Amino acid sequence: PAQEFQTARLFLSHFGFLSLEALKEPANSRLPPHLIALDSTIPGFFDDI
């Protein structure tokens, strides 16, 4: 049996959030796609949180 678990991808995929259409960049617009991954290495992220 398996030991480790990356439950995050399971959660994203099961609810239907994660898909090619969701990640596709919008056409002729500046709003971000339906799914966005943030960064925890850029300085000041936790301060903004």
Partner 1 sequence: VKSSLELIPLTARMVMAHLVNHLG
- What residue ranges bind partner 1 (CB under 8 A)? 2, 4-6, 9-10, 13-14, 18, 20
Rounded least distance, CB 49 to partner 1, Å: 27
- Closer CB to partner 1, 2 or 27, in the complex: 2
Measuring CA to CA, how many Å separate 30 from each of 4, 7, 9, 25? 38, 31, 26, 9
CB of 4 to partner 1, least distance (A): 7
Contact between 33 and 21 under an 8 Å Cβ cutoff? The reply is: no
Measured distance CA(15)–CA(29) in Å, rounded: 26
Q: How far is the CB of 3 from partner 1 (least distance, A)?
A: 9
